[PDB]
Amino acid sequence: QLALGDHAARQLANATKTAPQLSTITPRWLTHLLQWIPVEAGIY
Amino acid sequence: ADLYSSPHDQIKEQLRLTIETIKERQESELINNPEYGLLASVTDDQRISTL
Known part of the structure; x- marks a missing residue:
């Protein structure tokens, strides 16, 4: 070995961590396309 | 409620x-009330009956 290795050197390094990925996410186009109306007391 | x-x-x-x-x-x-109520608190000297 001539110099310090990558495996040893990484111990001082901070990894970039992503938020967990969810496979089931879909664009959900219908909710975006529909028009939403507020109801005063849950009755229409 | 919601x-x-x-x-x-x-x-x-x-x-x-x-x-x-x-x-x-x-x-x-x-x-x-059995221990602090008015009826329990009244005394025999202060209790009377109808004629």
């Missing part, structure tokens, strides 16, 4: 009715 609260708040209505019941119970206790 759905049926306009024009009246359900939680507030329930609380008001329950508090009314509690106050009626307090009035009953002030008279008939």
